[PDB]
Amino acid sequence: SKMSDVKCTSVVLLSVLQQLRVESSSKLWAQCVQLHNDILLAKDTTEAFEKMVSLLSVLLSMQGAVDINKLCE
Amino acid sequence: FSSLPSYAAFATAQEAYEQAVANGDSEVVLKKLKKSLNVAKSEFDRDAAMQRKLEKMADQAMTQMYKQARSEDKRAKVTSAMQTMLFTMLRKLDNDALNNIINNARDGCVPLNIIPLTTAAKLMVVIPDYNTYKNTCDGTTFTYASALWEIQQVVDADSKIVQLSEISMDNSPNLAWPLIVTALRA
Amino acid sequence: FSSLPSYAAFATAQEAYEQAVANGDSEVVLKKLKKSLNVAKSEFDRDAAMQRKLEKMADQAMTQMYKQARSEDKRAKVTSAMQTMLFTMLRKLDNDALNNIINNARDGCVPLNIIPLTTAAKLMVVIPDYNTYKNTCDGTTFTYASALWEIQQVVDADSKIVQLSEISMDNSPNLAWPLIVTALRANSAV
Amino acid sequence: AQSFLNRVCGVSAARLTPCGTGTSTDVVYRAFDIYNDKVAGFAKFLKTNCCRFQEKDEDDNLIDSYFVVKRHTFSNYQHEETIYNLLKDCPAVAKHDFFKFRIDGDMVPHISRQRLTKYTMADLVYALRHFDEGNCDTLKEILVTYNCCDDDYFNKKDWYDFVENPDILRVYANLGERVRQALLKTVQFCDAMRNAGIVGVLTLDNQDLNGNWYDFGDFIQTTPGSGVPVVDSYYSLLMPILTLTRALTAESHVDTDLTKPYIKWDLLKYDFTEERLKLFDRYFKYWDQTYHPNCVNCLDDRCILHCANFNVLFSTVFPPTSFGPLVRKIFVDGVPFVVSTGYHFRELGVVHNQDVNLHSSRLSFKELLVYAADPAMHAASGNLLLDKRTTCFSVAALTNNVAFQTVKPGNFNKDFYDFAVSKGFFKEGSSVELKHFFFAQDGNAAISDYDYYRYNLPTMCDIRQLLFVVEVVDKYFDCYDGGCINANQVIVNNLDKSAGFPFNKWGKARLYYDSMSYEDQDALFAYTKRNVIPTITQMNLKYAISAKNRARTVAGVSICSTMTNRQFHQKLLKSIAATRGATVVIGTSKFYGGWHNMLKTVYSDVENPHLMGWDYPKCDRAMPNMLRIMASLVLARKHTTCCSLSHRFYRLANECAQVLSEMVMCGGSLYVKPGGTSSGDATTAYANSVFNICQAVTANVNALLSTDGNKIADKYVRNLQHRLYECLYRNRDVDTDFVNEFYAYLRKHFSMMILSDDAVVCFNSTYASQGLVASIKNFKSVLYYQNNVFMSEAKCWTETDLTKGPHEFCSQHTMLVKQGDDYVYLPYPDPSRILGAGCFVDDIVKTDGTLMIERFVSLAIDAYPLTKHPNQEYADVFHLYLQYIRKLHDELTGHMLDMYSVMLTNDNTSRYWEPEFYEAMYTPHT
RNA sequence: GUAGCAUGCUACGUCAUUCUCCACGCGAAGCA
RNA sequence: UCAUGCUUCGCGUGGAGAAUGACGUAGCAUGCUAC
Numbered sequence A: 001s002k003m004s005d006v007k008c009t010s011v012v013l014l015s016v017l018q019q020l021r022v023e024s025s026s027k028l029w030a031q032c033v034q035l036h037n038d039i040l041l042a043k044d045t046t047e048a049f050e051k052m053v054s055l056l057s058v059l060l061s062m063q064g065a066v067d068i069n070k071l072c073e
Numbered sequence B: 001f002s003s004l005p006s007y008a009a010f011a012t013a014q015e016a017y018e019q020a021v022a023n024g025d026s027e028v029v030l031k032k033l034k035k036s037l038n039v040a041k042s043e044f045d046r047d048a049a050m051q052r053k054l055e056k057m058a059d060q061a062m063t064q065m066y067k068q069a070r071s072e073d074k075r076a077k078v079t080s081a082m083q084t085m086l087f088t089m090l091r092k093l094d095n096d097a098l099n100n101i102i103n104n105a106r107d108g109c110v111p112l113n114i115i116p117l118t119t120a121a122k123l124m125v126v127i128p129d130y131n132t133y134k135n136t137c138d139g140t141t142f143t144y145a146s147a148l149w150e151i152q153q154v155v156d157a158d159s160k161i162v163q164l165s166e167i168s169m170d171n172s173p174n175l176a177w178p179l180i181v182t183a184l185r186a
Numbered sequence C: 001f002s003s004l005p006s007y008a009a010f011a012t013a014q015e016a017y018e019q020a021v022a023n024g025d026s027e028v029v030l031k032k033l034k035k036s037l038n039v040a041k042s043e044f045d046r047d048a049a050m051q052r053k054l055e056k057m058a059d060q061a062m063t064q065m066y067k068q069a070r071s072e073d074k075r076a077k078v079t080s081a082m083q084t085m086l087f088t089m090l091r092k093l094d095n096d097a098l099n100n101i102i103n104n105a106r107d108g109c110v111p112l113n114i115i116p117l118t119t120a121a122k123l124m125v126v127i128p129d130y131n132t133y134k135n136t137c138d139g140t141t142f143t144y145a146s147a148l149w150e151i152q153q154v155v156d157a158d159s160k161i162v163q164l165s166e167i168s169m170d171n172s173p174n175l176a177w178p179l180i181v182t183a184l185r186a187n188s189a190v
Numbered sequence D: 001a002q003s004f005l006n007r008v009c010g011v012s013a014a015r016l017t018p019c020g021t022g023t024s025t026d027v028v029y030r031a032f033d034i035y036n037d038k039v040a041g042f043a044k045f046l047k048t049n050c051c052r053f054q055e056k057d058e059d060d061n062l063i064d065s066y067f068v069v070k071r072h073t074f075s076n077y078q079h080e081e082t083i084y085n086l087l088k089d090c091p092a093v094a095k096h097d098f099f100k101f102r103i104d105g106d107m108v109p110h111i112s113r114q115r116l117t118k119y120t121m122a123d124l125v126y127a128l129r130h131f132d133e134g135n136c137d138t139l140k141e142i143l144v145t146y147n148c149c150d151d152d153y154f155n156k157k158d159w160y161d162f163v164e165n166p167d168i169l170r171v172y173a174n175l176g177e178r179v180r181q182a183l184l185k186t187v188q189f190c191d192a193m194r195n196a197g198i199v200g201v202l203t204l205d206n207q208d209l210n211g212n213w214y215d216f217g218d219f220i221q222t223t224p225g226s227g228v229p230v231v232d233s234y235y236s237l238l239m240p241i242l243t244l245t246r247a248l249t250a251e252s253h254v255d256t257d258l259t260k261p262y263i264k265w266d267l268l269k270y271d272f273t274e275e276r277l278k279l280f281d282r283y284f285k286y287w288d289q290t291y292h293p294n295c296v297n298c299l300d301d302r303c304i305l306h307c308a309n310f311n312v313l314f315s316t317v318f319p320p321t322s323f324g325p326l327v328r329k330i331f332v333d334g335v336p337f338v339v340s341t342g343y344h345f346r347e348l349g350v351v352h353n354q355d356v357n358l359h360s361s362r363l364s365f366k367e368l369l370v371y372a373a374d375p376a377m378h379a380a381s382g383n384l385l386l387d388k389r390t391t392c393f394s395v396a397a398l399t400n401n402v403a404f405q406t407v408k409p410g411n412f413n414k415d416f417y418d419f420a421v422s423k424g425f426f427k428e429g430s431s432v433e434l435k436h437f438f439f440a441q442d443g444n445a446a447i448s449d450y451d452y453y454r455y456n457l458p459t460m461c462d463i464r465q466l467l468f469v470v471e472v473v474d475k476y477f478d479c480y481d482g483g484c485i486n487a488n489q490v491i492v493n494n495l496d497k498s499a500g501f502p503f504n505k506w507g508k509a510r511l512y513y514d515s516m517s518y519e520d521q522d523a524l525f526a527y528t529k530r531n532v533i534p535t536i537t538q539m540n541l542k543y544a545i546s547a548k549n550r551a552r553t554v555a556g557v558s559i560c561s562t563m564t565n566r567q568f569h570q571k572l573l574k575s576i577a578a579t580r581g582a583t584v585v586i587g588t589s590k591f592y593g594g595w596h597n598m599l600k601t602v603y604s605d606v607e608n609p610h611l612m613g614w615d616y617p618k619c620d621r622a623m624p625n626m627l628r629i630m631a632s633l634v635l636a637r638k639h640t641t642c643c644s645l646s647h648r649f650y651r652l653a654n655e656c657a658q659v660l661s662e663m664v665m666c667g668g669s670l671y672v673k674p675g676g677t678s679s680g681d682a683t684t685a686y687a688n689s690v691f692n693i694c695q696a697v698t699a700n701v702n703a704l705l706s707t708d709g710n711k712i713a714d715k716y717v718r719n720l721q722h723r724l725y726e727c728l729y730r731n732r733d734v735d736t737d738f739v740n741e742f743y744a745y746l747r748k749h750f751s752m753m754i755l756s757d758d759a760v761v762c763f764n765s766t767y768a769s770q771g772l773v774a775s776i777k778n779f780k781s782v783l784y785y786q787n788n789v790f791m792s793e794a795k796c797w798t799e800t801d802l803t804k805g806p807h808e809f810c811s812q813h814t815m816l817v818k819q820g821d822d823y824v825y826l827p828y829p830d831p832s833r834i835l836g837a838g839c840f841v842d843d844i845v846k847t848d849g850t851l852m853i854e855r856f857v858s859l860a861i862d863a864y865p866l867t868k869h870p871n872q873e874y875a876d877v878f879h880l881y882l883q884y885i886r887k888l889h890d891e892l893t894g895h896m897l898d899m900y901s902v903m904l905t906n907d908n909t910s911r912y913w914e915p916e917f918y919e920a921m922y923t924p925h926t
Numbered sequence E: 001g002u003a004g005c006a007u008g009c010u011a012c013g014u015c016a017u018u019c020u021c022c023a024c025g026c027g028a029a030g031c032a
Numbered sequence F: 001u002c003a004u005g006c007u008u009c010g011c012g013u014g015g016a017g018a019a020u021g022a023c024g025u026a027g028c029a030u031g032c033u034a035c
């Protein structure tokens, strides 16, 4: 149950990005949308994880928006 | 359904009828007692219908209030709930890359751009202190996101180029952190 | 309610029946008083039902006249807000060029699709990729629709000013395409 | 044998080699348009009578120039010589050579035909009309021979596909001039055979791929100057190739040649009546039926179709800025407006509003609606636009900034997912997995999904067969009743739906339905019966869960069009949705035994039943304009008692103005819709069914006509085919006695069940095998040449065991179960669909289960049938849904008692986690 | 025999529920 | 921004009809009382 898991994590991760006003940047939002859609359609889990790394790095690039040290703790 | 004076009257009438039937009294008395019992039962049934309507209305109002309150709560704290859910799911995945980048970003070693997927791609990672530098950067290779990257450049905090040799055990206070390591995927 | 005109008769019959029930009244005649009370109750109940039906009909008629009032209010609001749109875009119609094209028509009818193509004083070009920019909008002045347009402003998908010097083959990847360039007709279709 | 070749070469510089077998006939499969007293049809016959000799030029370099020599009877050889002498002056006649060569014992006559190509025009038409990707050798050879494309072009991934590689269109367009030349030569030939007084029938198979005509067998010589050519089958069979090949593309160049620049058409010019008449008399001179450039003057529906099938072709020559609402300056109280007072339809020609009142005084609510609906003021006052994202013609931008609309990822119901995982779902290798998600899109979602309209190309239908398929379709729709209804009788389900553009800036449809009385609605509807009202139709963006990356856009037609279209079509549409047992199964529920009844109706009494089915790739975006006008014309066949011809034409013009060539509004900017249905007009689901039935009937016609005819053992079907050819290409009036017979034939051997672009057919497998009804290949061919769509094998399905039911209809698979000790067909969904509906939701509020337990009740109602599926995961899905409903009820009761200390435990809520409440939905009682 | 009370049948009015149909409002689900 | 149709479930209000029960008024048959 590790593929349908990354599918749902990508859905929630793109929702979290979208609520951080990432749509205000057309280029970054297009990249995030492409990664999310490719994760949802992915067949092999290796590529899905290597594509989830990029989306999470998009989330982690903006350090002021999300407080990792508190959510993770 | 007790707790009503109408039901008390109905019970009294029923008890009187049950005591009289064994008595076998005059037929006229039995019939008029039956009529009075039926009248009392009709009043009790009317009151029961009223109480059923009132209870149904109260339950409808209570469900409406509960739905309003829970919808307001759901739409209010969406921002916090979404992030908590996201990090719960990322913990659940227990990957090698996601955990690595999250642990690095906790200490402040976040990227400056999207982590690429192709060999001919550039990654720019901000290294906030010498401890994390020694943790990740070893020799002339960078270990970030469960992959090896070739450090092509190390920009000082003031945009000044820094040679990999100048970053040493005692030069650490001298240099102006945070650095920006620009590397290529290997 | 207890305000019905015939409620007095029912109340009096009830009082008489109550008096006859106890205090030492007749047993066989009290049935007559009970029957009188029953008929009075039936009459009063039917009158109350009719009055309640009339009251509910009156309430319904007070929800249909109010609804008509709101319908007419909304009609007036939309009429004003719909003929205030027409006049706004009626003032924006530059009468010089529009009259020029109309009066050259055979019988006053001209296709709609040429009204902006021959009279509009501003052009918006949406460019998806840089090859299209180079082909169509390159430079500050370009030619389109047999007219000369001088570029006035270039913005990207984020609606941020993009200088003409920032649109290059090497710097193309750093822009948020499509680019929206709003040229202005030069010397009225020169 | 050497002497025979020496004599065939004749007195000419002919250096030719043999193709036969040394003075013997050559066997060859060639397409023939044949109509004898015994056979008829446009089939592919093997006729072995000639002896081709291929010419060599440039010192052994082989070319395509064949000296087709044939042996004749000496009785019709004399006749074919006295007919060629008259016609030998024409430049459109291949040079013959008559010579009697002593072969065995006598001087048997020979008729050599000099320098003919390998294939004829009939071969090209048959190759394109009957297109099968498995044996398209002739089409590839024709394409290669005439430099359309290199021989290695066909090693491409699905080269033929019109969607995967649009470049194939270009490859076809290189035949254009060729075809055009042929047309010109045909006219020349006709003139010749009229000057010499020669009565004959022109067929495609007597014209090589250079235009030259070479057969004069059935030409009788009448008095000079009054010979009549017969060109019905010729022009009709050739029609779909004139637009597929873009033949008249050379009419856009000065002096009509591709080596000169485009003619600079005047911009103010909108009336091209004289140009249309010139083109008609230039290419179709000897077409008998009268052609009205403007279909305002057309007599009936069968004339509107005929005269618009020509306008679709002639409108590709004229500039695209001339097609649109004609705009005139009117004064209202002294303030000059700019309102639309006409239209220039690519198909219907120029239409002028009848009661145009310039110099009015005041604007009534109806007139304000009309003036604010049409794009005259909007496009006139807006600033020019050149949108390079799309290929569609862009009119104007209504704002100073482009509006970009995105699509949100879609929320995740983590509670249901956790529950399902705890119940063993979503494991590795499990047969049930997540396939349906909410896909997110960038800022160009709407414009891209709109630009998908590039698949709508101008299609010139074969008019002689369309005019028969229309009668058979109308027969299919003859069990209903329709007409115009007053504004009192119009039923509007939901009035909280948007009123399109610009009317959504001030309210919903409720505001515009309650703010103008029935008198105003009747006045507007009566206005549209003699005026054309153009409208702007916003292109919305649907938000739904699917398995494809396709952000579907739907047309938000204005309220002005919707009100009138409702009044016009509501009675017929409500009658189509209240009839049980018809081919169109719109309005039939799948519950309470509806699915079983529908299936048992489709099966009917077909003798050797096989099932087949299809689903059009882009039904709305690929549909040609002719078929949509046809659908609108057969939906209006019910107004024979309430609307006159003028009223019906102006209603057709209004429909074409606002749902066929509308001016869409895709994000603060006006574009021009190329064509095809606007999914969102008042008849979208019922105009797709007519188009579906039209395609099916066309497939049957082509399947029956392309059959040999000599090989049909059944003497009734042979006469049916002969009479069908007579009714198509030898009659101009409708023969109801045979329309009824062909309809009965189709009903008996080809049972349909239609719902929009989704069809299920139970057909006689023996006939389909022999070629007497439409197989799936015939339907694919018809789609290729009449939709500009190649229907891949993903959209098609076939089932040779009808006890398994349709493989897929309306996304619902069918299975035969044991219901109530009886065997019935039940529809079950895709389990991924139900699971993904549970896991992912639209609104964030829906992610709290206790709020919405009716979501899961409805999803369990839909997922109940899976309980009987032999696979166990599919039944586990339904049990999971019931268990989750129980969990939600428990949690709701707990929360309610925890917050408001009032126990809430009813006995009527325990039936939503019991299977009986859901079994009752599929038992045929209610 | 007139009037009143008791028993047996028919008609009308008012209430108490159960069910059927429709007219509408509200929330939700599927399908083209 | 979210169109046109069809179908189904949930709840609420209104109208009509049917079923059982209750009370009352009226009509017909028998019994008892005032005259």
Ligand SMILES: O=c1ccn([C@@H]2O[C@H](COP(=O)(O)OP(=O)(O)OP(=O)(O)O)[C@@H](O)[C@H]2O)c(=O)[nH]1
Pocket (backbone or CB within 6 Å): D542, D554, D615, D616, D617, D618, D619, D620, D621, D677, D678, D679, D680, D684, D688, D756, D757, E032
């Ligand atoms: O939400 C919808 C879906 C469909 N429709 C109407 O039904 C038609 C067919 O709707 P389908 O769902 O069958 O899709 P499609 O054939 O357009 O495209 P593919 O999925 O095959 O690629 C549409 O083109 C439109 O006419 C709607 O009006 N609304």
Ligand SMILES: [Mg+2]
Pocket (backbone or CB within 6 Å): D615, D616, D617, D618, D619, D757
């Ligand atoms: Mg489809």
Ligand SMILES: [Zn+2]
Pocket (backbone or CB within 6 Å): D290, D291, D292, D295, D297, D298, D299, D303, D304, D306, D307
């Ligand atoms: Zn005509």
Ligand SMILES: [Zn+2]
Pocket (backbone or CB within 6 Å): D483, D484, D639, D642, D643
């Ligand atoms: Zn009509």
